[PDB]
Amino acid sequence: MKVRAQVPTVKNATNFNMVADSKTSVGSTLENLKAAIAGETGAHAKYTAFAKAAREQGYEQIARLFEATAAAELIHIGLEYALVAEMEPGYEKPTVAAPSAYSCDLNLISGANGEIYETSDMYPAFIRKAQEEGNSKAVHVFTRAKLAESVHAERYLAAYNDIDAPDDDKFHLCPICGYIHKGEDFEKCPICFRPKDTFTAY
Amino acid sequence: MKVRAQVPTVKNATNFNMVADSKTSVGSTLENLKAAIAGETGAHAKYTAFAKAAREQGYEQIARLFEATAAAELIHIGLEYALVAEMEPGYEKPTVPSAYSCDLNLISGANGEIYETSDMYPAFIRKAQEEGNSKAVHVFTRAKLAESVHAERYLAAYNDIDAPDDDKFHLCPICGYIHKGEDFEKCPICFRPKDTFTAY
Numbered sequence: 001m002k003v004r005a006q007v008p009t010v011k012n013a014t015n016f017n018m019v020a021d022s023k024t025s026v027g028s029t030l031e032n033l034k035a036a037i038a039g040e041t042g043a044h045a046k047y048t049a050f051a052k053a054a055r056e057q058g059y060e061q062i063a064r065l066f067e068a069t070a071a072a073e074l075i076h077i078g079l080e081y082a083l084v085a086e087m088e089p090g091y092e093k094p095t096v097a098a099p100s101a102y103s104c105d106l107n108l109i110s111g112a113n114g115e116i117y118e119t120s121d122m123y124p125a126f127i128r129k130a131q132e133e134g135n136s137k138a139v140h141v142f143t144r145a146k147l148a149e150s151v152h153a154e155r156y157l158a159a160y161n162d163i164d165a166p167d168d169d170k171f172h173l174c175p176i177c178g179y180i181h182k183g184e185d186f187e188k189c190p191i192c193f194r195p196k197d198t199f200t201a202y
Numbered sequence: 203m204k205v206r207a208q209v210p211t212v213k214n215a216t217n218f219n220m221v222a223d224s225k226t227s228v229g230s231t232l233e234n235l236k237a238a239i240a241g242e243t244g245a246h247a248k249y250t251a252f253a254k255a256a257r258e259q260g261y262e263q264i265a266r267l268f269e270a271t272a273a274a275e276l277i278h279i280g281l282e283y284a285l286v287a288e289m290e291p292g293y294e295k296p297t298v299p300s301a302y303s304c305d306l307n308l309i310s311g312a313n314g315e316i317y318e319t320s321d322m323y324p325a326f327i328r329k330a331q332e333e334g335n336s337k338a339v340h341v342f343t344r345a346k347l348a349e350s351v352h353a354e355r356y357l358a359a360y361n362d363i364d365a366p367d368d369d370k371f372h373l374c375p376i377c378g379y380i381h382k383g384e385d386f387e388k389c390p391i392c393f394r395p396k397d398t399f400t401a402y
């Protein structure tokens with residue numbers, strides 16, 4: 001993902017449309033924030049399981065990608081949770097059980113599909129609802145998450161394509177959004193503009 | 203996709219597992235070849251329609267990617283048709299889509315590619331192996347490998363939908379491999395030299 005003159009927003013970007021045949025139940029923005037947190041909690045458990053399996057299967061680099069992405073989802077949860085907490089102090093983040101991890105290639109596909117669903121269906125749906133309800137804070141949070149998900153999708157497909165050709169590149173995760181970059185060739189986050197030296201390496 | 207020391211095959215690669223919850227009806231290799239052709243014919247019509255829409259939507263480069271991928275599916279059809287014609291002389295290829303916003307079309311493309319690379323082709327490859335049809339295994343393998351590359355190209359285009367560049371997309375002459383830009387030497391799927399590619 002290239003760095004543009006300004007950070008991507010639903011106002012200056014053109015990949016924010018929701019698939020017409022959406023598989024996402026949309027409620028109030030508060031409900032959607034909670035729904036997103038639930039989905040991300042599941043994603044985190046999935047990627048964590050996928051990472052462990054990857055290591056056992058001998059895919060050290062892919063395991064690191066799964067771990068970096070799991071961490072990215074935790075950032076999304078943090079962003080979403082912060083908004084929910086302001087509106088409902090008693091709200092507690094949910095916990096889920098760990099799902100099964102299968103062959104690494106299939107796990108990468110599972111990851112890619114989930115990411116695609118989130119970036120082109122769920123988040124766009126939640127963003128639209130937030131826009132229609134005038135909840136700019138939610139639009140911001142959902143937009144940030146949405147943008148990282150499509151990057152995750154690409155990273156998973158790239159790993160899948162080179163499943164038998166890994167390298168020693170580290171994955172760098174942005175400190176405040178889910179953007180992940182493979183290798184050192186980047187300057188700042190294309191999603192939020194945080195400098196490269198603020199990233200965490202996986 | 204990186205160029206390995208060896209040409210990727212179902213024998214030396216580890217991304218040929220098929221999804222457990224398959225959406226692919228599997229029959230004889232002959233039927234599967236025809237099914238693949240029908241699917242690719244749909245894909246070609248889809249991408250051609252997406253390219254047209256992309257140009258109307260003002261995304262010239264993405265239009266070119268759609269055109270390149272459509273051409274890739276045509277290559278797949280050619281490989282599969284050749285085998286079918288041999289297994290059934292006289293066979294006639296079938297004829298067949300709605301287009302939406304460019305970003306959605308890229309996602310639709312990506313999803314179709316993922317289905318083909320992780321579901322359809324792997325299933326057909328295994329059935330071909332079971333029946334001992336080596337030609338089909340080779341053809342299905344070649345197609346399968348290109349589809350995952352297409353998926354990545356579509357997601358890459360989606361991520362930089364508002365940040366196009368002047369890169370041309372290069373299509374391999376005998377397989378569906380597509381490379382964006384000039385930084386490549388040969389096809390990682392079949393090893394064909396860069397000078398034999400066609401630019402889009």
Ligand SMILES: [Fe+2]
Nearest residue numbers: 115148149152
């Ligand atoms: Fe994600």
Ligand SMILES: [Fe+2]
Nearest residue numbers: 315348349352
């Ligand atoms: Fe394809």
Ligand SMILES: [Fe+3]
Nearest residue numbers: 040043073118
């Ligand atoms: Fe997510």
Ligand SMILES: [Fe+3]
Nearest residue numbers: 174177189192
């Ligand atoms: Fe960031």
Ligand SMILES: [Fe+3]
Nearest residue numbers: 242245275318
């Ligand atoms: Fe295809």
Ligand SMILES: [Fe+3]
Nearest residue numbers: 374377389392
């Ligand atoms: Fe090739």
